[PDB]
A paper describes a structure:
The cryo-EM map of P7-[name]-TEC shows clear electron densities for 6-bp upstream double-stranded DNA (dsDNA), 9-bp DNA-RNA hybrid of the transcription bubble, 3-nt single-strand RNA (ssRNA) in the RNA exit channel, and 13-bp downstream dsDNA. The RNAP clamp in the P7-[name]-TEC is closed and the overall conformation of Xoo RNAP is essentially superimposable to E. coli TEC. The DNA–RNA hybrid in the P7-[name]-TEC adopts a canonical post-translocation conformation as in E. coli TEC, suggesting that P7 does not affect the conformation of the DNA and RNA during processive transcription elongation. P7 inserts into the RNA exit channel and makes extensive interactions with RNAP with calculated interface of 1182 Å2. The C-terminal helix of P7 (residues 48–62) forms a four-helix bundle with βCTR and β′dock. In the structure, [name] locates at outside of RNA exit channel, where it interacts with the tip helix of βflap domain (βFTH) with a hydrophobic groove of its NTD domain. P7 resides between [name] and the RNA exit channel of RNAP; the β2/β3 loop of P7 inserts into a cavity of [name] S1 domain and creates a moderate interface of 221 Å2. Specifically, the W32 of p7 inserts into a phenylalanine cage of F155, F165, and F200 on [name]. Structure superimposition between the Xoo P7-[name]-TEC and E. coli [name]-PEC reveals that the hairpin-interacting regions of [name] has been occupied by P7, explaining that [name] losses its activity of enhancing pause or intrinsic termination in the presence of P725.
P7 is the key phage protein to regulate gene expression programs of both host bacteria and phage Xp10. P7 binds to host RNA polymerase to inhibit transcription of host genes. P7 turns on transcription of late genes of phage Xp10 by assisting host RNA polymerase in bypassing intrinsic terminators preceding the late genes. The structures reveal a unique binding site (the RNA-exit channel) of the phage protein P7 on bacterial host RNAP, where P7 exerts dual regulatory activities on host RNAP—inhibiting transcription initiation and preventing transcription termination.
Numbering used by the authors:
A (entry chain C): 3 to 43, 49 to 237, 243 to 255, 277 to 510, 515 to 769, 775 to 920, 925 to 950, 953 to 1010, ...
B (entry chain D): 745 to 849, 860 to 933, 950 to 966, 977 to 1007, 1012 to 1024
C (entry chain D): 1324 to 1371
D (entry chain D): 249 to 316, 321 to 496
E (entry chain D): 1 to 147, 156 to 166
Write the structure that this text describes.
RNA sequence: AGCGGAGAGGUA
DNA sequence: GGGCTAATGACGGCGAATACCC
DNA sequence: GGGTATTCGCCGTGTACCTCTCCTAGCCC
């Protein structure tokens, strides 16, 4: 029932209710999107969709068509560690099979000659490493998700942005996937205006005339037209309501068409025109104001109905009539050339060119390409029943006159959809029928793009470039391999994966930071918003974010709200929207079924919150439950609810759930603590958190820094570098072997290590851990240590968020971290001569040359210091005594320059990597390390072959108890081992890839183990950051009544100011846990029985979730008691459990006080304090902001050549920028001579700084100031603008 | 903790009836982090606008330098205590202290100290003419007597001090920290100012026992006044 | 032309042909002379 | 004034003014070649239009033509703006004899004095240490004096302690919105890597003690030292510039 | 590249003035500013580290690359000053004059300054009493100008 | 061998 | 593989050209 | 000729510091 990892250690867990749904895979969305994009294992959507969309190519001269039947992804030529160490990219070749056919001209179409060029090389696709990372030039990059605007149609408005009036204007925008944007804007004079791609605005009458619509047809379709009589008119009972008893009397009477005088006809607009064949002229135009002469002509003609338009003040609006009155164009060709002149300014008009441009602007698949999610959003916003539709924008009048083959198929399925008139009519009913608008703040209005969609987009861009090349290349038609060019698609995929706003450098200092960086979503990007723009409307949280987007995990700085984090149970839907699970709630009892609802479907049903009490197993005993309907709180009876939350961890993310007592802390301090945990550094010995949550095991499992056993078995062969398991007959021919990484640098210059934890000869199951990773316990996540805390002011050393440390926290090496630096020595090729790595360097003493070998580089495992020469490199810089010295020696006497690699940070050298190019003779040390590598691979290949032969012989001995396949399997394993050894020997004997111009590269790994220093930044767990003031000996620290000295003395003044009190409960729970651990150690120190330990564990585990103690063993119970000798870890859920009574009971179980406050004595004078302070163990960690990285100074360094000023940054000896506000402060002081010697003498003047330096070193005082050189630069830059500036 | 506020302006119908000592629900924590994000965005834009206003005010007032010790300007400025219909904004003892006087209330061209402010408070003075920098007759500078005393030192301002950059920086200090019926509150005698009720501008100022003005209300046209007036009453009841 | 609309003040000074008398605080920082406020007032008194 | 920056492998970084100058020179040479050829009016009209557009892109790019994924800088953008030659090199300049470090709290210090690290003060007061080593006679040349400084014996600590005794330094907060963001202190040598500060100073600085860094500056002239002693000392700046 | 004898002398510039005058520049004054005329848009030749003659980076117009050195190498002494070499014509002087000297371009056709036209207080529009759109159409070669001040379409000009 | 333009992350 | 080779997710304040009937 | 009424542009929107990557690469042999 319990695995070996759970049997090793059991933590106490108390809460309100149990968890129904377990924690899913934390990195699932990226690997599922990349698996859907690759299609490595069909292949309907993904890369195959873009390959099927682009590759049909029709040439201009005909008889040239390109077809394909599929694509194959080749195996990578290098390993993951091979691309990590050598510097290559972990990519795979993409090969397609292009089929080229040639038709016969001036005859019927037939396949005259068809070829099939297999293995067409194009691009290299970087594969994932199983956790969401890929190696790009030796570095791991993480592409985060993008939260952009979903395609479709939206209706927005502006509040007081124009006309300075209370009336608001509406806007309709059609956002496609890869097409040109369409807009529909109103006008304060009641008119409609449209524009394409933010161009000059035009009325919609030009677009409707270019579509092919007449004014009479659009007036009959938009406005409801009534009839007239020859004057009289028809009576409408609904039209008389606008002008209740008179309308009811007219409805109950049932009147006919009554007579009406001519005073009602002058205020109307004619809908359709009237003509007379006897006269020969038009008696009335369409859509005009009626006059007396037009009425006289209509009476003389003898017309029956002239037509009218239903015009109201609020229910109806004559916007199309005013739009036709504004635009004077009445010709379709004039409208088309007006659209062509608005699109391309400064071009002569052409009929068929503008016709092809208007056809390719909106009504084609190669340019517009509206996606299916945009079609679904379009049909959901308009109100159509059908969901899936055409991928191109359809019109009823435009596609009716087309003669293409696809147009007849499109007109038969859509059957006059007319989406443009549908959008205009929906906007008209928004303006007139009093409809509601939607703002872009919901998670259903937004969409999530993963790495696969952006990779398919940049691959489609590269394929469009390749198609544009091949359309010219296939004009005169040879093999298809000479047509397809891999260079533009390779450059596009390299520019996407190398340098992009979505592909950034990751951090690998902590597993929690790795998990929250792979799960991070970001609204920035090429289609996203900018941080510099005013984005206050999107930085605030929306009620749709509950359950899908974490709210309290938000970085500090400019991007507060633009860079969000995904929730725990949140996942991506099939269309890209975010979804969260719920529970199916029947009337009464609640069924435990999981249904993932989208963001646009959660507002329709009443969803109850997770904070709902239940007396039975599944019921609702509350008359008013705290449910929500539209994101706000509501009190509803339980007979109307439909859904409920599955877990209280649904709101927070994986970085916000690991901090205990989140319900007792403020939101700002929780926001600080969720970001402070991502900067922790792994120490030498990591300790488990005494006050945890339970989600640390899922984060340590899904982080990937630890290894796990796929098949359980015997671990009888174990080493510090490799772990060999032996599977059983049920899981299995060869056994599995796991290689552990020992010492390699991460992306943040930290050390990662995998130390094993299993023993010799113990059975395991599938899923147990075998080696604890960096900053990782036996299955829990470990960030910091456990140490005594006292909240009291101590002589001003903990004054304002300052931290006091004892000598016992330093002398036991608790915060000692290992940092691995990368120092390289590059030997370029110059025109005067190539630089060598020789050890004989002039003007260098023997004290810096003893550590150098005969190769010129340093040994492995040599203690170096700051300024030591590690790699000796010389370069040639080019009287009869010099000729005599050159003739006495072998042309290596003089004319050399010393430029070697020095240490900037003292430590030992752990690895020396030497890279050489082909054609260069290898060094004896390079030959020696080559012999070492081939001996190592021969040794471990022989050991693996011996283990496989021993397993095969054991299976053969087990098979002959009661005969040929084991020998064939052993022969196949021997052939595979020989092929792998030949591949490794051929890989490590050839020259690596280098830049053009470098002959040799030497990389030296330097490992520095830094201790803790006064001034280092160290934060807690709840967001209480601090800086170490000084190191105090143990004799001055305050001690308790038993003699235990407190390590850290914190300040209690921050508690009422920052308003967080979860740290006090964490201190009390850590004090209770340390008391329980001391009681267990005191029980196991003497000769005690097993029953006393059993009843003590039964008392401290459950009190009446339920942990049985009579299940495992007696020896397993002794192992559990030995594992609990450092402390009993407690599990506190993020929004339930851990009340005051439970903490008081765990305090009262041991010999500990109830209030958690004991009286401690001062160590300096031996007297007693007046009050009792809170003493306990708090999980305190160390940040990455060191004191060595930030402390730097300079006197005189290098200067720039554009302007005579010092450089900037800690590197290259940069000076501090004396800003403008500091100059304002010095001018506020007065300070003429201080400000003159600050920006002229010290910084700008060339001769002035030399004169001041020599006057300092000589003793005399004669300061001569001068003009800054940047003023002369500004004068020379102004004079280049043909503007004379003279210094009179 | 009471009710929580939403950024659109509406208050939530249900409050948070739980402190940080007890547990908080998820619907209360949602409003808590909503208010926290609103406050963080508010102080970010406040810091940016304060920096821009500080830069603009520094670049506007940078030519004013104390050049001469005396100018000879007898224009003056009348100082009154600022009452905005409620509690006092700036009293007389803060607004008067630090500058010289123009007309005899006291001797002209004399720097005022705390003893002179205490003597004027014992004498119960209401308005004193002051010498300000808005009425100066200097050539490209401010007189040393019109500015008054320094703010860093309690003595007179020295000749050559740039009083523009200090003033602009002091105005730009707290920018990161920014955001019918006449019934009297305090007791004291009521003294009408500019009255004739047929009055265009009416001021219902009161005088306390020490001689300072605590309350000052506005009176519209046709305000009926009922009235050594005690507190808790209404001098002007209503005027619709 | 120090903080806003450098092109407009530059073309206005180019058309009008103005002459900067350096009687300020920021232009003495740009040119590189002493500040005419505080300890630098005696240098400006002795210069003119 | 417009130099080329080289990269690894012989490549050069791209420039903004050089491409505009090459475009102007190339279009002017094309106009001269079309004028010597006696071209018709349409071709020389289009060439003069291209010359006017290239001159417009050279003088003020981004106004009408916006010549280029990112628009390159011109002569007009190099003067105006925040990143121009007027705000980054004239009002605010990079200075030497300066450094920064984190700050802690020191309760044993006085109001007029502050702490300073040993290696930081050795790097800042290096010319005075060199002058005192030349005056004491421990080194004949400055090369032996520099090697004796990097050797780090006790005599260079004696020289550094004798130099820093009556020499004030200017401590500055990285935002300087306050008038009292720059104050002068007499530094002492501490055995650490941070800058200890008096607790009565950080109120006027508005500075906390969690990741706060403060840049220091040393005045080296006699007038600057006396100005820092007189009108920049922390004991002289008691009252606030806003109120009394 | 490296020079140590010229580096020791100081107090060469007094930098003492009273006022700063800014005005326009005549083409004769711009011609008197420069020292040479550029003709080719070539900065650095390929496969060699040498500047191009009559280019943007040239030694005959602005100054030599190395200090007290020519492009060919006929004069390699500090005693030679004010002498122009015969093969590649450059002065044997300090290498700091490359930061001070400038060149000029002879345009085949005159162009208009965009700082006097594109600004909203337009100076050429106020001096010629014309609107901004007319001068924008004339300067971009879309119409004609009579010489009294009216616009002309090319068909109307015909 | 020194002189640099973008993009990303983090601290006050 | 190789060496020359010429987008449309901001927002507010403000001075200047069109439209037009009296 | 002359007053409102929109309307197209012009011009701006905090400082200081610390890490990392990637830079014009394309083509017909
Ligand atoms: Mg701080
Ligand atoms: Zn005055
Ligand atoms: Zn020469």
């Amino acid at each position: 029932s319990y695995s070996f990892t759970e049997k090793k250690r059991i933590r106490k867990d108390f809460g309100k209710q149990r968890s129904i749904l377990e924690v899913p895979f934390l990195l699932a969305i990226q690997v599922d999107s990349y698996r859907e994009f690759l299609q490595e294992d069909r292949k309907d959507l993904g890369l195959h969709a873009a390959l099927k969309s682009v590759f049909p190519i029709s040439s201009y001269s005909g008889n040239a068509a390109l077809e394909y039947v599929g694509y194959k992804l080749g195996q990578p030529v290098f390993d993951e560690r091979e691309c990590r160490q050598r510097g290559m990219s972990y990519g795979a070749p993409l090969r397609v099979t292009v089929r080229l056919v040639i038709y016969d001209r001036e005859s019927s179409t037939k396949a005259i000659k068809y070829v099939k060029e297999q293995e067409v090389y194009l691009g290299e696709i970087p594969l994932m490493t199983g956790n969401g990372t890929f190696i790009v030039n030796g570095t791991e990059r993480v592409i985060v998700s993008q939260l952009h605007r979903s395609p479709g149609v939206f209706f927005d408005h502006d509040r007081g942005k124009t006309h300075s009036s209370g009336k608001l204007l509406y806007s309709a925008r059609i956002i496609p996937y890869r097409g040109s944007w369409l807009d529909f804007e109103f006008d304060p004079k009641d008119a409609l205006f449209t524009r394409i791609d933010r161009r000059r605005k035009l009325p919609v009458s030009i677009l409707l005339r270019a579509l092919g619509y007449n004014n009479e047809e659009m007036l009959a379709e938009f406005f409801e037209i009534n009839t007239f009589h020859i004057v009289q008119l028809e009576l409408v009972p609904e039209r008389l309501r606008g002008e209740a008893r008179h309308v009811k009397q007219l409805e109950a009477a049932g009147v006919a068409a009554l007579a009406v005088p001519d005073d009602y006809l002058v205020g109307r607009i004619l809908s359709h025109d009237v003509v007379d064949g006897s006269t020969g002229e038009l008696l009335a135009n369409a859509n005009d104001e009626i006059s007396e002469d037009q009425l006289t002509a209509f009476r003389k003609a003898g017309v029956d109905a002239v037509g009218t338009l239903w015009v109201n003040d609020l229910d109806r609006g004559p916007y199309l009539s005013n739009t036709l009155r504004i635009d004077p164009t009445k010709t379709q060709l004039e409208a088309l050339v007006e659209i062509y002149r608005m699109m391309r300014p400064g071009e002569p008009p052409t009929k068929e060119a503008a016709q092809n441009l208007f056809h390719n602007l909106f009504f084609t698949f190669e340019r517009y390409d509206l996606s299916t999610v945009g079609r679904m959003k379009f049909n959901r916003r308009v109100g159509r029943k059908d969901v899936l539709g055409e991928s191109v924008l359809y019109d009823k009048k435009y596609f009716a006159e087309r003669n293409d083959e696809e147009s007849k198929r499109l007109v038969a399925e859509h059957t006059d959809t007319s989406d443009i008139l549908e959008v205009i009519k929906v906007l008209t009913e928004i303006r007139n029928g009093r409809g509601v608008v939607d703002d872009i703040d919901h998670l259903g209005n937004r969409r999530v793009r993963s790495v696969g969609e952006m990779a398919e987009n940049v691959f489609r861009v590269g394929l469009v470039r390749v198609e544009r090349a091949v359309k010219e290349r296939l004009s005169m038609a040879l093999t298809p391999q000479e047509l397809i060019n891999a260079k533009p698609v390779a450059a596009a995929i390299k520019e996407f994966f190398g340098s992009s706003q979505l592909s950034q450098f990751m951090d690998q200092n902590n597993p929690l930071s790795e998990v929250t960086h792979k799960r991070r979503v970001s609204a920035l990007g090429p289609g996203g918003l900018t941080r510099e723009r005013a984005g206050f409307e999107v930085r605030d949280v929306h009620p749709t974010h509950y359950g899908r987007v974490c709210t309290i995990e938000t970085p500090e700085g400019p991007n507060i709200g633009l860079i969000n984090s995904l929730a725990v149970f949140a996942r991506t839907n099939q269309y890209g929207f975010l979804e969260t699970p719920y529970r199916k709630v029947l009337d009464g009892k609640v069924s435990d079924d999981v249904e993932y609802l989208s963001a646009i479907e959660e507002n329709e049903y009443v969803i109850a919150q997770a904070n709902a009490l239940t007396d039975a197993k599944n019921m609702l005993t509350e008359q008013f439950v705290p449910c929500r309907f539209q994101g706000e709180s509501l009190l509803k009876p339980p007979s109307e609810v439909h859904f409920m939350d599955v877990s209280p961890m649904q709101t927070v993310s994986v970085a916000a759930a690991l901090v205990p007592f989140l319900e007792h802390d403020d939101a700002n301090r929780a926001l600080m603590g969720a970001n402070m945990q991502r900067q922790a550094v792994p120490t030498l010995r990591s300790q488990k958190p005494l006050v945890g949550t339970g989600i640390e095991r899922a984060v340590a499992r899904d982080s990937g820094v630890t290894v796990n056993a796929l098949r359980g078995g015997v671990i009888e062969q174990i080493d510090a570098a490799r772990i060999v398991v032996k599977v059983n007959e049920a899981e299995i021919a060869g056994v599995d072997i796991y290689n552990l990484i020992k010492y390699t640098r991460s992306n943040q210059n930290t050390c990662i290590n995998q130390r094993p934890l299993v023993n010799v000869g113990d059975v395991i199951a599938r899923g147990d851990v075998l080696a604890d990773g960096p900053s990782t316990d036996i299955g829990e996540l470990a960030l910091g240590q456990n140490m005594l805390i006292a909240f009291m002011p101590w002589n001003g050393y903990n004054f304002e968020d300052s931290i006091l440390l004892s000598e016992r926290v330093v002398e036991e090496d608790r915060y000692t971290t290992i940092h691995i630096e990368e120092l390289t020595c590059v030997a370029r090729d110059t025109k005067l001569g190539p630089e060598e790595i020789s050890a004989d360097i002039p003007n260098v003493s023997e004290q810096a040359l003893n550590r150098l070998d005969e190769s010129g580089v340093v040994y492995i495992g040599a203690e170096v210091r700051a300024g030591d020469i590690m790699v000796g490199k010389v370069t040639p810089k080019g009287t009869p005594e010099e000729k005599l010295l050159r003739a006495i020696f072998g042309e290596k006497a003089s004319d050399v320059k010393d430029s070697s690699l020095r240490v900037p940070m003292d430590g030992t050298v752990i690895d020396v990597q030497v890279f050489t190019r082909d054609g260069i003779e290898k060094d004896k040390r390079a030959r020696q390390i080559e012999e070492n590598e081939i001996k190592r691979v021969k040794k471990d290949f022989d050991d693996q072959f011996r283990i496989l032969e021993a397993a095969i012989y054991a299976r053969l001995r087990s098979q002959i108890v009661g005969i040929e396949r084991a020998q064939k399997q052993i022969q196949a394993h021997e052939k595979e081992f020989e092929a792998r050894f030949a591949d490794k020997r051929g890989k490590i004997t050839q020259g690596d890839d280098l830049a053009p111009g470098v002959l040799k590269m030497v990389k030296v790994f330097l490992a520095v183990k830094r201790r803790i220093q006064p001034g280092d930044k160290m934060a807690g767990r709840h967001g209480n950051k601090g800086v170490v003031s000084n190191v105090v000996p143990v004799e001055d620290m305050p001690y308790m009544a038993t003699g235990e000295s407190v390590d850290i003395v914190l300040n209690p003044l921050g508690v009422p100011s920052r308003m967080n009190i979860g740290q006090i409960l964490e201190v009390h729970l850590g004090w209770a846990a340390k008391g329980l651990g001391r009681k267990i150690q005191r029980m196991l120190e003497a000769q005690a029985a097993v029953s006393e330990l059993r009843k003590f564990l039964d008392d401290i585990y459950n009190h009446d979730q339920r942990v049985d103690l009579s299940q495992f063993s007696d020896e397993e119970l002794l192992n559990l008691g030995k594992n609990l000798i450092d402390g009993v870890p407690m599990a506190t859920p993020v929004f339930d459990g851990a009340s005051e009574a439970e903490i008081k009971r765990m305090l009262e179980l041991a010999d500990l006080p109830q209030s958690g406050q004991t009286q401690l004595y001062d160590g300096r004078t031996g007297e007693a304090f007046d009050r009792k302070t809170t003493v306990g163990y708090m999980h305190y960690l160390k940040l990455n902001h060191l004191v060595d990285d930030k402390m730097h100074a300079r006197s005189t360094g290098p200067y720039s050549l554009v302007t005579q000023q010092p450089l900037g940054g800690k590197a290259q000896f940069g000076g501090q920028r004396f800003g403008e506000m500091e100059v304002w402060a010095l001018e506020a002081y007065g300070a003429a001579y201080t400000l003159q010697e600050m920006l002229t003498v010290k910084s700008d003047d060339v001769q002035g700084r030399n004169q001041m330096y020599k006057n300092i070193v000589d003793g005399e005082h004669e300061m001569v100031a001068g003009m800054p050189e940047s003023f002369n630069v500004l004068v020379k830059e102004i004079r280049s603008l043909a503007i004379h500036m003279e210094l009179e | 903790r009471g009710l929580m506020a939403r950024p659109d302006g509406s208050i939530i119908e249900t409050p948070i009836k739980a402190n940080f000592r007890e547990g908080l629900n998820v619907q209360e924590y949602f409003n808590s982090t909503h208010g926290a994000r609103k406050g963080l965005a508010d102080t970010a834009l406040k810091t940016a606008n304060s920096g821009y206003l500080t830069r603009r005010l520094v670049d506007v007032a940078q030519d004013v330098v104390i050049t001469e010790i005396d100018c000879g300007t007898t224009e003056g400025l009348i100082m009154t205590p600022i009452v905005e219909g409620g509690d006092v904004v700036e009293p007389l003892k803060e607004r008067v202290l630090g500058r010289v006087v123009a007309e005899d209330v006291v001797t002209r061209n004399t720097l005022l100290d705390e003893a002179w402010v205490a003597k004027l408070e014992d004498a119960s003075v209401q308005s004193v003419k002051v010498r300000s920098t808005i009425s100066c007759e200097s050539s490209f500078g401010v007189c040393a007597r019109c500015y008054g005393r320094d703010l860093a030192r309690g003595h007179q301002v020295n000749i050559g001090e740039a009083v523009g950059v200090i003033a602009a920086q002091s105005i730009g200090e707290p920018g990161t920290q920014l955001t019918d019926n006449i019934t009297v509150k305090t007791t004291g005698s009521v003294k009408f100012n500019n009255l004739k009720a047929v009055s265009r501008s009416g001021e219902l100022s009161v005088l306390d026992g020490h001689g300072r003005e605590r309350e000052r209300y506005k009176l519209p046209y046709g305000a009926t006044i009922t009235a050594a007036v005690k507190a808790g009453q209404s001098v002007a009841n209503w005027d619709p | 032309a120090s903080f806003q609309e450098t092109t407009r003040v530059l073309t206005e000074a180019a058309v009008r042909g103005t002459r900067d008398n350096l009687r300020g605080l920021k232009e003495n920082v740009i040119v590189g002379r002493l500040i005419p406020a505080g300890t630098g007032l005696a240098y400006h008194a002795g210069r003119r | 004034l417009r130099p080329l920056v080289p990269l690894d492998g012989g490549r050069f970084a791209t420039s903004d003014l050089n491409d505009l100058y090459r475009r102007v020179i190339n279009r002017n040479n094309r106009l001269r070649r079309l004028l010597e050829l006696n071209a018709p009016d349409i071709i020389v009209r289009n060439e003069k239009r291209m010359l006017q557009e290239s001159v417009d892109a050279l003088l003020d790019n981004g106004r009408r033509g916006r010549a280029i994924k990112r628009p390159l800088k011109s002569l007009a953008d190099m003067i105006k703006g925040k990143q121009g030659r007027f705000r980054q090199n004239l009002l605010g300049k990079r200075v030497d004899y300066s450094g920064r470090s984190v700050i802690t709290v020191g309760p044993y210090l006085k109001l007029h004095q502050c702490g300073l690290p040993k290696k930081m003060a050795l790097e800042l007061f290096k010319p005075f240490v060199f002058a005192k080593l030349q005056r004491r006679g421990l080194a004949t040349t400055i090369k032996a004096a520099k090697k004796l400084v990097e050797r780090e014996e006790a005599e260079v600590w004696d020289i550094l302690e004798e130099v820093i005794r009556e020499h004030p330094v200017l401590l500055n907060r990285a935002p300087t919105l306050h008038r009292l963001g720059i104050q002068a202190f007499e530094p002492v040598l501490i055995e650490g890597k941070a800058i200890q500060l008096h607790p009565l100073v950080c109120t006027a600085f508005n500075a906390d003690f969690d990741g706060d860094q403060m840049a220091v500056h040393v005045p080296l002239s006699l007038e600057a030292q006396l100005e820092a002693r007189a009108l920049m000392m922390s004991t002289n700046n008691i009252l606030s510039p806003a109120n009394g | 590249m490296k020079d140590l004898l010229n580096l020791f002398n100081q107090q060469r510039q007094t930098l003492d003035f009273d006022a700063i005058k800014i005005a326009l520049a005549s083409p004769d004054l711009i011609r008197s500013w420069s020292y040479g005329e550029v003709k080719k848009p070539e900065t650095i030749n390929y496969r060699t580290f040498k500047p191009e003659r009559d280019g943007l980076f040239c030694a005959a117009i602005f100054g030599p690359i190395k200090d007290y050195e020519c492009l060919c190498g006929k004069y390699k002494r500090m005693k030679h000053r004010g002498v122009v070499c015969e093969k590649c014509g450059t002065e044997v002087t300090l290498a700091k004059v490359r930061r001070e000297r400038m060149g000029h371009i002879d345009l085949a056709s005159p162009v208009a300054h965009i700082w006097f036209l594109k600004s909203l207080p337009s100076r050429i529009g106020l001096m010629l009493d014309m609107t901004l759109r007319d001068i924008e159409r004339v300067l971009y070669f879309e119409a004609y100008v009579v010489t009294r001040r009216q616009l002309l379409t090319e068909e109307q000009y015909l």
